[PDB]
């Protein structure tokens, strides 16, 4: 049911172009826009049966090959933003950095590997039909291509103890399911610290049926009865190219919470008022594309221990319904990953450290998505998420951060201090210490330090953009399938769901059409 330890596939290159190509220009039963989480597994599942072309704006993974290991994680953030690297870097309206991915395989490449089912129970509360079965089959063909049970790592072994210590119950053992107490998960990188991704995914697609443009910029979608009918897109030299779908075929937006509001507004679909004030023709009105964009806050503290600790990626988890913690431990360094820490101005770790965070669930605080460009897809959208605007984030921030006090108060923990006094004092810490235990100094600590956990979400949902078959409403032969979909987290860590999400949907094309 799980992956063994193996090299990264790129078998899949034998049906990528570059998107210079004009022989690529056509029709298609399908065309996929953003070859990301979602979009790779959904673009393979439809070529079983159909023509399809993936258009990704980034190239392939081969050029950054510090995407194809867990130890090359922090690299892809060090590395400067040039408009061609895997990360490309973002600051949000409220000034917290944060990074999304420019690259085929979209941010499973970049990202920090830990895999989890959705919540058993979000299902129900979506109210969308699920097939339930269904789901879980295309859950184990992920699982089964990419997720691995990890090795025992001291740091994770640690705080898998700190966690079942300071009450995080129950001890859930090895398990991929998001549920209440302490358990290993799954990872995306292998035993030997490769990177498995959804570009991996393209290899289960037909390769007489599915063809991959790169650096391919999709620009505007086309439309007619409103119908989709294609897609302008640019190449790297910057010409122009057309693809359109045929008969009873679709366009399918999976670029992302970022990308899809951005493409449905620079095509005319979106706010009446919002695009006629920008004199963007209004193709199909919905005050809501853009509308409901959600950053869960990653709140944290950073332990300098006295003897040096061994680097680990994240798989020991801490659920409880109101927040969501994991620990990582890391080399030091002296160039900052961008969105790591919420501004460049933070103090640079000089020995290996331990990443403490707590996540807040939801969240319920939201912004939005507008265009920077009414006409330049290559130019970022403004994003905004309005972090702590609702105070019940708030109130589950405090929870959490009393918690992280509890855990820096173990057993498990205490050979980690520099002086062996009774209190978290002993320890030593990069940046602001935790909090006084009034619930106002907690609130600050929450507010003041906040950075982005990188699971935002949202910006074209499913009940105010979608329906409950993830189609635009109002428009033929567009659908969108990727995080701007779902207004609450499935879990603490989502690729897991989105890359199961992108297959099931192509799934319910195939059905709906046969
Ligand atoms: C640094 C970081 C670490 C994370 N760590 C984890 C973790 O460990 N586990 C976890 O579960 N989640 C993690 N996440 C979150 C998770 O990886 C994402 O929520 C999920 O991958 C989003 O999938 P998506 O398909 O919505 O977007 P993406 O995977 O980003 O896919 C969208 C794709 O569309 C492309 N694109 C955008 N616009 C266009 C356009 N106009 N034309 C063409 N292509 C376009 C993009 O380049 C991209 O490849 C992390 C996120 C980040 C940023
Ligand atoms: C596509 O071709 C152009 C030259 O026309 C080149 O500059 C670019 O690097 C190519 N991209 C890829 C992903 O091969
Ligand atoms: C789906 O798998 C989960 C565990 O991830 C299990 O709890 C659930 O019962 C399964 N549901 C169905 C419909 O099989
Ligand atoms: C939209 O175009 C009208 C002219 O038709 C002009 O008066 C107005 O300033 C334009 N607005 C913008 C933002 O371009
Ligand atoms: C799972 O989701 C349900 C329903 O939204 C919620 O009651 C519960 O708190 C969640 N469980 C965990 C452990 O987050
Ligand atoms: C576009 O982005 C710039 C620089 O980030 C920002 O400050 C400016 O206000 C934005 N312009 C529009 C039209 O949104
Ligand atoms: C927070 O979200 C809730 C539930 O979705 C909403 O009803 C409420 O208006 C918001 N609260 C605040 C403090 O804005
Ligand atoms: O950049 C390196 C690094 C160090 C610790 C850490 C993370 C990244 C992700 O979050 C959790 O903890």
Same mark, same amino acid.
């Not at 892809?76 to 000034?95: A, C, I, Y």
């Not at 449905?264 to 979106?270: A, D, F, K, Q, T």
């Not at 020991?316 to 501004?343: E, H, K, M, N």
């Not at 935790?434 to 990188?454: G, K």
């Given at each position: 049911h799980?992956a ?6 790129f078998?899949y290159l034998k ?7 004009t022989?690529l220009?056509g029709?298609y039963d ?5 070859? $990301?989480?979602?979009?790779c ?5 439809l ?6 072309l993936?258009?990704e704006?980034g /190239?392939?993974?081969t ?6 290991t867990?130890?090359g994680?922090?690299?892809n953030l060090?590395?400067?933003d ?6 490309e870097?973002?600051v949000?309206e409220?000034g ?10 979209? /941010?499973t490449?970049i990202? %920090?590997?830990v ?6 129970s979000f299902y129900s ?6 097939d339930?079965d269904?789901?879980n ?6 699982? @089964? ?7 025992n790592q001291s740091?994770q =072994?640690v705080?898998?103890?700190?966690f079942?210590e300071?009450?995080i119950l129950?001890?859930?053992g090895?398990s !991929? @399911?998001?549920?209440?107490?302490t358990?290993?998960? $799954?990872?995306?990188? +292998?035993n &030997?610290?490769?990177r ?12 007489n049926?599915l !063809?991959? %443009?790169v650096?391919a ?5 086309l439309?007619?009865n ?8 640019t190449?790297? +030299? ?5 693809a359109?779908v045929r008969? &009873?075929?679709?366009?399918?937006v =999976?670029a $992302? /919470?970022?990308?899809?509001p951005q ?8 706010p ?12 199909q009105?919905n ?10 806050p990653? &709140?944290?503290?950073?332990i ?5 600790i ?6 020991? !988890?801490?659920?409880?319904? +109101?927040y ?5 431990s890391?080399?030091?360094? =002296?160039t ?6 919420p501004?460049t101005?933070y103090?640079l ?5 331990a990443?403490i ?6 969240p319920?605080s939201?912004?939005?998505?507008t265009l920077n460009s009414?006409?330049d897809?290559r130019?970022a959208?403004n994003?905004?998420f &309005?972090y702590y605007?609702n105070?019940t984030?708030?109130?589950?921030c405090?929870?959490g951060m ?5 855990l820096?108060?173990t057993?498990?923990?205490?050979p ?11 320890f030593?810490?990069?940046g602001?210490?935790?909090?006084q /235990?009034? @619930? ?7 507010? *003041? ?5 990188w699971?935002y979400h949202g910006?074209?949902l499913?009940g105010k953009?979608? *329906? @409950?078959?993830?189609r ?6 567009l659908?969108?399938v990727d995080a ?5 987290e499935?879990?603490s860590?989502?690729?897991?769901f989105?890359?199961?999400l ?11 059409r046969s």
């Amino acid at each position: 049911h799980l992956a063994n330890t193996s090299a990264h596939d790129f078998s899949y290159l034998k049906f990528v172009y570059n998107a210079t190509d004009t022989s690529l220009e056509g029709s298609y039963d399908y065309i996929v826009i953003g070859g $990301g989480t979602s979009g790779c597994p959904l673009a393979a599942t439809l070529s079983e049966k159909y023509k399809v072309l993936l258009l990704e704006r980034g /190239t392939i993974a081969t050029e950054y090959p510090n995407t194809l290991t867990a130890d090359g994680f922090a690299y892809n953030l060090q590395q400067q933003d040039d408009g061609k690297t895997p990360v490309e870097r973002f600051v949000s309206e409220d000034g917290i950095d944060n990074v999304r991915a420019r690259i085929l395989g979209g /941010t499973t490449i970049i990202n %920090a590997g830990v895999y989890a089912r959705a919540n058993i129970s979000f299902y129900s509360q979506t109210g969308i039909e699920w097939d339930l079965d269904l789901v879980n089959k295309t859950y184990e063909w992920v699982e @089964d291509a990419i997720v691995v049970k990890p090795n025992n790592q001291s740091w994770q =072994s640690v705080i898998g103890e700190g966690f079942l210590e300071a009450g995080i119950l129950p001890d859930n053992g090895f398990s !991929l @399911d998001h549920e209440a107490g302490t358990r290993l998960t $799954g990872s995306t990188f +292998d035993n &030997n610290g490769t990177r498995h991704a959804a570009d991996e995914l393209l290899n289960k697609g037909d390769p007489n049926n599915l !063809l991959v %443009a790169v650096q391919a910029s999709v620009e505007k979608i086309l439309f007619s009865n409103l119908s989709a009918i294609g897609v302008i897109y640019t190449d790297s +030299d910057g010409n122009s190219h057309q693809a359109f779908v045929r008969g &009873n075929g679709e366009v399918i937006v =999976s670029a $992302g /919470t970022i990308g899809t509001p951005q493409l449905l507004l620079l095509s005319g679909v979106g706010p009446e008022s919002y695009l006629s004030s920008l004199n963007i023709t209004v193709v199909q009105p919905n005050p809501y594309v853009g509308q409901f964009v959600y950053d869960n806050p990653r &709140n944290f503290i950073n332990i300098l221990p006295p003897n040096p600790i061994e680097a680990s990626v994240v798989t020991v !988890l801490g659920i409880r319904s +109101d927040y969501y913690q994991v620990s990582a431990s890391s080399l030091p360094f =002296s160039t900052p990953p961008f969105s790591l820490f919420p501004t460049t101005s933070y103090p640079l770790p000089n020995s290996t450290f331990a990443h403490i965070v707590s996540q807040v669930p939801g969240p319920l605080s939201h912004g939005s998505v507008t265009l920077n460009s009414s006409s330049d897809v290559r130019i970022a959208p403004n994003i905004k998420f &309005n972090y702590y605007s609702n105070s019940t984030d708030l109130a589950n921030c405090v929870s959490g951060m009393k918690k992280l006090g509890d855990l820096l108060r173990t057993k498990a923990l205490e050979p980690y201090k520099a002086r062996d006094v009774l209190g978290i004092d002993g320890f030593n810490y990069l940046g602001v210490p935790l909090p006084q /235990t009034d @619930d106002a100094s907690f609130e600050t600590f929450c507010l *003041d330090n906040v950075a982005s956990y990188w699971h935002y979400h949202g910006g074209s949902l499913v009940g105010k953009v979608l *329906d @409950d078959s993830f189609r635009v409403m109002g428009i033929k032969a567009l659908r969108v399938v990727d995080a701007s979909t779902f207004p609450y987290e499935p879990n603490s860590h989502p690729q897991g769901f989105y890359l199961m999400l992108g297959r099931y949907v192509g799934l319910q094309i195939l059905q709906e059409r046969s």
